[PDB]
From a paper:
[name] ([name]), a 14-kDa basic protein is an angiogenic ribonuclease and member of the bovine pancreatic ribonuclease (RNase A) family (also known as [name]). Like RNase A, [name] cleaves preferentially on the 3′ side of pyrimidines and follows a transphosphorylation/hydrolysis mechanism. In addition, the crystal structure of human [name] has revealed that it has an RNase A fold and the catalytic triad (residues H13, K40 and H114) is conserved. The enzymatic activity of [name] is several orders of magnitude lower than that of RNase A towards conventional RNase substrates, but essential for its angiogenic effect.
Author numbering: 2 to 121
Protein backbone atom coordinates (compact mmCIF):
# COMPACT_ATOMS: atom_id res chain seq x y z
CA UNK A 1 0.00 0.00 0.00
CA UNK A 2 1.63 3.24 -1.29
CA UNK A 3 -1.43 5.50 -0.95
CA UNK A 4 0.02 7.57 1.92
CA UNK A 5 3.26 8.13 0.00
CA UNK A 6 1.19 9.29 -2.98
CA UNK A 7 -0.79 11.59 -0.72
CA UNK A 8 2.46 12.94 0.79
CA UNK A 9 3.62 13.92 -2.71
CA UNK A 10 0.29 15.56 -3.49
CA UNK A 11 0.37 17.63 -0.29
CA UNK A 12 4.11 18.32 0.10
CA UNK A 13 6.08 17.85 -3.18
CA UNK A 14 6.52 20.25 -6.10
CA UNK A 15 9.61 19.48 -8.16
CA UNK A 16 10.22 22.72 -10.10
CA UNK A 17 8.58 25.94 -8.97
CA UNK A 18 9.88 29.20 -10.28
CA UNK A 19 8.58 32.12 -8.25
CA UNK A 20 7.44 30.91 -4.88
CA UNK A 21 5.28 33.94 -4.12
CA UNK A 22 1.78 34.41 -2.57
CA UNK A 23 0.14 33.70 -5.95
CA UNK A 24 2.20 30.48 -6.27
CA UNK A 25 0.75 29.35 -2.90
CA UNK A 26 -2.83 30.37 -3.78
CA UNK A 27 -2.67 28.38 -7.03
CA UNK A 28 -0.90 25.23 -5.83
CA UNK A 29 -3.08 24.95 -2.70
CA UNK A 30 -6.16 24.87 -5.06
CA UNK A 31 -4.47 22.52 -7.54
CA UNK A 32 -3.63 19.97 -4.79
CA UNK A 33 -7.12 20.05 -3.20
CA UNK A 34 -6.19 21.78 0.08
CA UNK A 35 -8.83 24.54 0.06
CA UNK A 36 -12.09 22.89 1.36
CA UNK A 37 -11.67 24.01 4.04
CA UNK A 38 -8.52 26.19 3.73
CA UNK A 39 -5.54 24.36 5.23
CA UNK A 40 -4.01 26.72 7.79
CA UNK A 41 -0.34 25.87 7.03
CA UNK A 42 1.24 23.74 4.33
CA UNK A 43 4.82 23.26 3.13
CA UNK A 44 6.07 22.00 -0.26
CA UNK A 45 9.51 20.45 -0.79
CA UNK A 46 11.25 21.14 -4.13
CA UNK A 47 13.98 19.26 -6.08
CA UNK A 48 13.99 15.52 -6.79
CA UNK A 49 11.87 12.81 -5.09
CA UNK A 50 14.81 10.51 -4.47
CA UNK A 51 16.43 12.91 -1.94
CA UNK A 52 13.15 12.93 0.04
CA UNK A 53 12.75 9.13 0.01
CA UNK A 54 16.39 8.91 1.15
CA UNK A 55 15.40 10.55 4.47
CA UNK A 56 13.87 7.18 5.33
CA UNK A 57 17.35 5.52 5.25
CA UNK A 58 20.69 6.24 6.93
CA UNK A 59 21.75 7.88 3.61
CA UNK A 60 19.88 11.13 4.29
CA UNK A 61 18.21 10.84 7.72
CA UNK A 62 18.51 10.44 11.49
CA UNK A 63 15.81 9.29 13.94
CA UNK A 64 14.00 12.19 15.53
CA UNK A 65 11.65 12.62 18.56
CA UNK A 66 9.04 9.74 18.64
CA UNK A 67 9.44 7.62 15.49
CA UNK A 68 10.06 10.55 13.07
CA UNK A 69 13.09 11.20 10.92
CA UNK A 70 15.08 14.38 10.19
CA UNK A 71 16.99 14.88 6.97
CA UNK A 72 20.74 15.41 6.79
CA UNK A 73 20.51 17.49 3.59
CA UNK A 74 18.80 20.89 3.29
CA UNK A 75 15.89 21.33 0.86
CA UNK A 76 14.38 24.25 -0.97
CA UNK A 77 10.90 24.62 0.49
CA UNK A 78 7.91 26.93 0.37
CA UNK A 79 5.47 27.38 3.21
CA UNK A 80 1.97 28.62 2.47
CA UNK A 81 0.25 30.22 5.47
CA UNK A 82 -3.43 31.10 5.48
CA UNK A 83 -4.46 34.66 6.25
CA UNK A 84 -7.81 36.44 6.56
CA UNK A 85 -10.57 35.59 9.05
CA UNK A 86 -12.26 32.68 7.29
CA UNK A 87 -11.70 28.92 7.14
CA UNK A 88 -13.37 28.76 3.68
CA UNK A 89 -12.45 29.80 0.11
CA UNK A 90 -11.25 31.92 -1.41
CA UNK A 91 -8.11 30.97 0.56
CA UNK A 92 -5.50 33.75 0.70
CA UNK A 93 -1.93 32.52 1.39
CA UNK A 94 1.33 34.22 2.39
CA UNK A 95 4.35 32.40 0.91
CA UNK A 96 7.63 31.95 2.80
CA UNK A 97 10.45 30.40 0.77
CA UNK A 98 13.11 28.64 2.78
CA UNK A 99 16.14 26.34 2.71
CA UNK A 100 16.66 23.82 5.52
CA UNK A 101 16.31 20.15 6.51
CA UNK A 102 12.86 18.63 6.91
CA UNK A 103 11.17 16.27 9.35
CA UNK A 104 9.03 13.39 8.07
CA UNK A 105 7.57 10.07 9.22
CA UNK A 106 8.42 7.07 7.08
CA UNK A 107 6.56 3.81 6.48
CA UNK A 108 8.11 0.94 4.41
CA UNK A 109 10.92 3.27 3.31
CA UNK A 110 8.59 5.97 1.97
CA UNK A 111 7.69 9.36 3.56
CA UNK A 112 4.02 9.46 4.64
CA UNK A 113 3.80 12.59 6.85
CA UNK A 114 5.50 15.99 6.95
CA UNK A 115 5.94 17.57 10.39
CA UNK A 116 4.60 21.11 9.85
CA UNK A 117 5.69 22.33 13.29
CA UNK A 118 9.18 23.30 12.11
CA UNK A 119 7.69 25.79 9.57
CA UNK A 120 5.28 27.62 11.99
Amino acid sequence: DNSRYTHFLTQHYDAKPQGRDDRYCESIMRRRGLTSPCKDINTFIHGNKRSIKAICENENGNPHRENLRISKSSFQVTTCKLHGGSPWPPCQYRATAGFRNVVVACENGLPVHLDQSIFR
